[PDB]
């Protein structure tokens, strides 16, 4: 019957009906009766509206302001916005349901209905449905009957006659094909939309292949599931299950846990991006020279403050490197500094000549050229990249000394916090005094110096990498501090030469060369300096308590690399402070609730309360709240500096062991299932990282002291 509708009605009416039905996911191919009904309704509405105009005088005219406005045949949103605009302008009532026409002359909405059954029944149905005595109703019938509301047929007799003649013509044409019976009988259920969604074709075959082994069709599986009832299936299957499948609890007694097994190999070496405890800084007091603020100017002044430079020579060579290249790099840095000092207006940034020594040290032209596989299919000696595991290393004693130094109290302030708003609330005053204590404790910690050094170095490195990508830049390592006398001091630790930084991925590494001053002889702990090449660059006259002593001053030179992620997280190293303070405050708070008073002053000044924070040959050692704060700050700083997957894995897998030990200490009768597996997982993360190995040793000591 669809072809009949296509050949009967106008193309615009047909396409409007198709759109209206498809708006609700109805297919005109299978819903032919509804298709014809909607087509007839649209045709009737259009005939009703057309050939009726309004003259400028304001009277209906038939041949400009159209007499009627169509609302049927539009989108739901389009029709509703048209209705809303009409209601807002003319002020008529808003119909509860979408009408079909609007009459401007009569100024009211009209519903037009076409039916195959008796007119009166449908009129009663519609009147009950709308239930509003403001929207006109007009019902036509294919038999030639018409009815309206209050017998008010707004349309002229001629137009209604045309509508009736058209309806009769459609009726006769449909009856000629014997399609009228279904059309008339289907009107009852034309207002219900039946959702259809069927699985056929390739999808049906896929469904038949996605069932348990003993099923051949989706329908069979559905039938089995629908009639399924539970009769001891789980119980019987459990009874059949072998008893070797179990979760046997093994008690975690005070003698069960064993120390972690650290790896074996050559001692681990320093891998920090800069020296921590062996760093030496040349400082200028109260910098007030012209151009203060520019790193290069301060670096030049700091270098000028020192006399005693000698001829550099190799003291501790780099085993795998070309030491003459490092020596030439240092000499070139000195020459470039001299040249820049010779000029009057020193530039903001200085690029370095791309000499052979810098080309080698920065790894220029070391990557094999990348080529598409399409153009290299004829290459015969292609081999896959290496993915060897890291080489194990043993735990060295220098990392513990580094941490001990990081936890110490310094003489100079290292951070100058910005001001905040005035305190008004009493809690704000308490917080202010507590923060005074915390800032005093934390601003004089070596870990704070490391934080500032790393933040500045990473910021400068990223700025140079992004601003200058194809140039070798010189980046002095600068820091600012306030001495015990309250006078500003600017310190230079060394220099960094940045290589090409065409960084595309977040893990792409820019190589750089770091040269740092130091007073530490590399020959005392050579294993710590495997990556470094250490020169003897000067003789320094230091003032001791009794007199003055001359000592060698070395330059630790090495090649390192850093990525965008590493620099990003290096910049956000001040967050470490929070990680400590938030803990410390919490501890204090935990006690205050017990004592119903603030214990900050007692904890910091009287030092009445102490926590076990260290180990000595005597045994466990206790420190005050300030020592604990500094220790936690140093731990956070070292986590930031020595971050690696090993550390993350070890922390995650050792938290569980710590919690089990705590449960044992709480007399909660802890129990495990595969404790050996947990130990293996923990030990899998100890390979070469000095920080992770130190943490593992700390955990072993804690186990020893907590088991007893």
């Amino acid at each position: 019957m669809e072809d009949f509708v296509r050949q009967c009605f106008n193309p615009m009416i047909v396409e409007l009906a198709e759109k209206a039905m498809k708006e609700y996911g109805e297919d005109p191919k299978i819903e032919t009766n509804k298709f014809a009904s909607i087509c007839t309704h649209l045709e009737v509405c259009f005939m009703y509206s057309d050939f009726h105009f309004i003259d400028e005088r304001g009277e209906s005219t038939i041949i400009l302001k159209h007499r009627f406005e169509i609302i049927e045949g539009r989108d739901r949103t389009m029709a509703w916005t048209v209705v809303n605009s009409i209601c807002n302008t003319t002020g008529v009532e808003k119909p509860k349901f979408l009408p079909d026409l609007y009459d401007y002359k009569e100024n009211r909405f009209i519903e037009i209905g076409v039916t195959r059954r008796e007119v009166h029944i449908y009129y009663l149905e519609k009147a009950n449905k709308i239930k509003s005595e403001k929207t006109h109703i007009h019902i036509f019938s294919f038999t030639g009957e018409e009815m309206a509301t209050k017998a008010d047929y707004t349309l002229d007799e001629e137009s209604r006659a045309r509508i009736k003649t058209r309806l009769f013509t459609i009726r006769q044409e449909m009856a000629s094909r014997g399609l009228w019976d279904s059309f008339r009988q289907s009107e009852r259920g034309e207002e219900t939309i039946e959702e259809r969604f069927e699985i056929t074709g390739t999808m049906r075959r896929l469904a038949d292949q996605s069932l348990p082994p003993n099923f051949s069709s989706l329908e069979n599986f559905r039938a089995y599931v629908d009639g399924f009832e539970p009769n001891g299936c789980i119980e019987g299957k459990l009874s059949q299950m072998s008893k070797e499948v179990n979760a046997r609890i093994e008690p975690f007694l005070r003698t069960t846990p064993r120390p972690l097994r650290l790896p074996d190999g050559p001692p681990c070496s320093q891998r920090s991006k800069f020296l921590l405890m062996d760093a030496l800084k040349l400082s200028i007091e109260d910098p007030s020279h012209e151009g203060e603020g520019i790193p290069l100017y301060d670096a030049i002044k700091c270098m000028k403050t020192f006399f005693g430079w000698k001829e550099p020579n190799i003291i501790k060579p780099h085993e795998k490197g070309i030491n003459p290249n490092y020596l030439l790099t240092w000499k070139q840095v000195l020459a470039e500094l001299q040249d820049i000092k010779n000029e009057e207006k020193i530039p903001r940034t200085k690029n370095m000549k791309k000499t052979s020594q810098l080309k080698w040290a920065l790894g220029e032209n070391m990557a094999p050229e990348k080529v598409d596989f399409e153009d290299c299919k004829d290459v015969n000696d292609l081999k896959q990249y290496d993915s060897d595991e890291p080489e194990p290393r043993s735990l060295a004693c220098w990392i513990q000394s580094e941490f001990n130094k990081a936890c110490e109290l310094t003489d100079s302030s290292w951070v100058e916090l910005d001001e905040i708003g005035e305190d008004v609330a009493p809690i704000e005053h308490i917080a202010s005094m507590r923060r005074n204590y915390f800032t005093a404790e934390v601003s004089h910690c070596r870990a704070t110096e490391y934080i500032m050094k790393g933040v500045y170095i990473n910021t400068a490195l990223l700025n140079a990498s992004c601003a200058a990508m194809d140039d070798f830049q010189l980046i002095p390592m600068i820091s600012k501090c306030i001495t015990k006398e309250g006078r500003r001091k600017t310190n230079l630790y060394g220099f960094i030469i940045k290589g090409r930084s065409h960084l595309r991925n977040d893990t792409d590494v820019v190589n750089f060369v770091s040269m740092e001053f130091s007073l530490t002889d590399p020959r005392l702990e050579p294993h710590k300096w495997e990556k470094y090449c250490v020169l003897e660059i000067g003789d320094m006259l230091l003032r001791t308590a009794v007199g003055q002593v001359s000592r060698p001053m070395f330059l630790y030179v090495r090649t390192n690399g850093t990525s965008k992620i590493k620099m990003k997280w290096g910049m956000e190293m001040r967050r470490c402070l929070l990680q400590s303070l938030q803990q410390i405050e919490s501890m204090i708070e935990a006690e205050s609730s017990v004592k119903e008073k603030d214990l900050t002053k007692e904890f910091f000044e009287n030092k009445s309360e102490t926590w076990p924070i260290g180990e000595s040959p005597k045994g466990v050692e206790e420190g005050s709240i300030g020592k604990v704060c500094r220790t936690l700050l140093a731990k956070s700083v070292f986590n930031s500096l020595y971050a690696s997957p090993q550390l993350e894995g070890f922390s995650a897998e050792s938290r569980k062991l710590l919690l089990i030990v705590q449960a044992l200490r709480d007399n909660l009768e802890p129990g495990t299932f595969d404790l050996e597996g947990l130990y293996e997982a923990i030990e899998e993360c100890l390979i070469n990282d000095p920080w992770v190995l130190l943490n593992a040793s700390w955990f072993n000591s804690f186990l020893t002291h907590a088991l007893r």
């Binding site: 405890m277 062996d278 760093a279 030496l280 800084k281 400082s283 403050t305 020192f306 006399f307 110490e408 109290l409 100079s412 005074n436 204590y437 005093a440 404790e441 004089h444 310190n491 007073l519 530490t520 320094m540 006259l541 230091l542 003032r543 001791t544 308590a545 002593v549 910091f604 000044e605 300030g626 020592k627």
Partner: peptide
């Protein structure tokens, strides 16, 4: 007003500061 102090701080054992010494003549 509050000056941090540590019992582990030796006033004489660190004869000189190896990280931040005085070298001006």
């Amino acid at each position: 007003s509050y000056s941090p102090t540590s019992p582990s701080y030796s006033p004489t054992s660190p004869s000189y500061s190896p990280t931040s010494p005085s070298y001006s003549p």
